[PDB]
Design a protein around this ligand. Structure first.
Ligand code: NAG
Ligand code: NAG
Lengths: 416, 416
């Protein structure tokens, strides 16, 4: 009954980046997706710009929607399924916020009834427009929208965890209404697991939406503390996968590694291929992985200003559509895992994750790089123990353990 | 040598409002400008959306520029000259701010060297693209950009007056560089004359840029304090014209009434025609008026949300291009003033304007509705004295007075 992982890329348009919606060129998209499918991927994750699609609360532009459908059709012709992220929102250090949510109309993104009603109509419209596309996977509410909810954001839209979970439900309700039965989820960046009192929580990620989405980025302190060529750096995606399982109510709830990339300087370009192989191999030794989706397809145009340096070189391909060695290595790992490798065995040893109550997760920073749970997991991993995780409050739950096939339970104090 | 006033409208596209740049339709623009020229106007004031034209600091979209040129050409065919406002920025309660100026990239609009360098390139590019258009008037830096500089803005980019004047110079330098010899100016809303310690000052408006631009809006407290059918309400545009002259170094520096409109409920629709006639008649009794430019050509689409109620009905035409009675009245006033009315006589009586030092204007609120200078001017006007204004520091300057033809000088204390 073992789950079979899918392989895709986050689509970063080579001509004009996500600004290409302002000058939409289907032939340029066709060429981008051509070089994507030639690498053997089976899906793309694609990004509308929210204020370009909804420049006024009650103006959702049909032409923008039509363009998204044409993109989805071009991908379908090429054997690529499409997940669409709705609320961007945040992309690569930039916040794209509609004028009707800011300054003179500043209205909290998660709690204002008019903005939330506008967000719902937006998501529902996209989902409904794509509902007749057989290659349309479903919606992700918005890329790492939790980054708006608190520190370190310079101007956050603050919310309680209950408010955040309620907002997520309404957003996913809208996706479900536009495209019933599709794969609708939300995706939060790693503050949801690592930052104490961050409003978006691990329970939100593991108990709302169809699958848990994780974004694995070793610039978060991991590569800095442990080195580029290290257990922790190579295993960081696998760790996020197994950590996220602890809060899941369903024992076989899949986990989607929706973002993973090789950020220089933390991963120099010369080590990107090697890093990509080890990371993919390591995470695919985890059961129930829904898929691996690399960030990103194409380098960002170097004529575009003010990106953090790491953002420019994250592509599997260059801006002129040449395949990088790291692109070649990911394609090779995809090919090997689709055909030549067996399913991963169950992880029967569980590391106890004690995070405080854990619905609220007030001390989740023990899971962050340098934390006791983090280092206990990498130590076990290095010892060959192939660990999963379990919450302290379920660590003696014979039904939880047996449902998961867990036969051994250890704490970080046990690991030392 | 008397100056002859021009007549135009602020172009508010009927299909999609200023969001029409996202779905640019030249035939829809042609039809809009057709109904404009049929009313007898000779120019339009037109508004790019800054973040649509410059979505990234070093991406100024050539297609957006091409669209602006096609709009300018369509207008030229119809005998309409074009002023282009650059930095929007602010339009009708909405702030359109590029992602590269906000939150994670928050960089002060008036002082950050990278943003200011980006603004310069933007203005220079627009001006240069239109420089070969014989109907291209010139640039206005940006619509009421001073609203970003302080209270009551909820999130201002604060600046000292010296910083604001320096920024204006650099912005106009860029316009001049792209289109030498053209009519380049800046336009600040009435806080520049009315709000104590507002960073943009009357000296900035009267001593930087080719002409002084004023925006006359009787919802600023005037209609509320004095009534819709009153001297002060009818004369408010004329007052702003004559007030703005006090800070001018050149005695014949023209003043452009770049915005004037009839906002309901302060001016009910049934009184818009009558209000428009009286306002135009009153301001055109002021010498050196560069022109009168009505806000706006077309009602805002009522399907667009979150505008202040007054914004929807400010058009001379409805959203379906029917001419309103107020449109008919403005066209009639234009026709009469172009052919049937003599030039206004000089205003030889000057009201003293004591504002504190006045370069800095720390007590300019004496010019605001309810202020001593304001009410002294309306009282003189009602008495038939046809007043101009003079700064306290120049009130005994025999050369200033004679250069202006001023033969009588009175203070508000004199008027009582
Ligand atoms: C402010 C900032 O740059 N935040 C980044 C975000 O852009 C990125 O998507 C995320 C990936 O995990 O990492 C965050 O640290
Ligand atoms: C915050 C706000 O609505 N400000 C308005 C502005 O939209 C308008 O252009 C201006 C005209 O003078 O009047 C201001 O009061």
């Amino acid at each position: 009954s073992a789950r079979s992982p899918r392989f895709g890329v986050n689509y970063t348009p080579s001509n004009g980046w996500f600004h290409h919606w302002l000058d939409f060129d289907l032939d340029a998209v066709r060429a981008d997706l051509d070089s994507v499918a030639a690498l053997g991927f089976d899906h793309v994750r694609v990004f509308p710009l929210w204020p370009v699609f909804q420049p006024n609360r009650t103006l959702i532009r049909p032409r923008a929607v039509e363009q998204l459908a044409a993109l989805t059709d071009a991908a379908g012709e090429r054997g690529l399924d499409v997940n669409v992220d709705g609320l961007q929102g945040h992309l690569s250090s930039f916040d794209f916020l509609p004028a009707w949510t800011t300054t003179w109309h500043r209205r909290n993104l998660f709690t204002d009834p008019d903005v939330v009603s506008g967000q719902a109509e937006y998501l529902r419209t996209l989902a409904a427009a794509l509902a007749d596309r057989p290659n349309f996977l479903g919606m992700t509410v918005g890329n790492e929208i939790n980054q708006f909810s608190g520190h370190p954001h310079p101007d956050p839209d603050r919310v309680t965890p209950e408010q955040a979970g309620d907002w997520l439900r309404r957003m996913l309700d809208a996706c479900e209404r536009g495209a019933p039965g599709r794969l609708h989820l939300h995706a939060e960046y790693d503050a949801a697991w690592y930052l104490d009192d961050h409003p978006f929580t691990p329970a939100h990620s593991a108990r709302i939406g169809a699958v848990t989405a994780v974004h694995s980025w070793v610039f978060n302190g991991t590569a800095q503390r442990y080195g580029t060529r290290s257990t922790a750096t190579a295993q960081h995606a696998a760790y996020l996968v197994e950590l996220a399982k602890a809060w899941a109510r369903e024992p076989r709830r899949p986990v989607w590694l929706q973002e993973v990339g090789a950020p220089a300087p933390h991963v120099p370009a010369e080590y990107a291929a090697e890093f990509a192989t080890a990371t993919i191999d390591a995470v695919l030794d985890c059961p129930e992985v829904w898929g691996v989706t690399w960030w990103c397809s194409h380098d960002v145009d170097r004529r575009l200003a003010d990106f953090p340096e790491l953002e420019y070189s994250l592509g599997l391909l260059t801006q002129d559509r040449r395949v990088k060695p790291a692109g070649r290595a990911v394609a090779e790992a995809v090919r090997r895992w689709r055909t030549e490798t067996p399913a991963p065995r169950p992880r029967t040893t569980a590391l106890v994750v004690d995070v405080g109550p854990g619905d609220q997760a007030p001390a989740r920073s023990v899971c962050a790089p340098g934390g006791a749970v983090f280092e206990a997991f990498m130590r076990l991993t290095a010892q060959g123990a192939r660990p999963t995780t379990v919450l302290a409050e379920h660590a003696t739950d014979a039904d939880h353990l047996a449902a998961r096939g867990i036969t051994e339970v250890v704490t970080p104090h046990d690991v030392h």
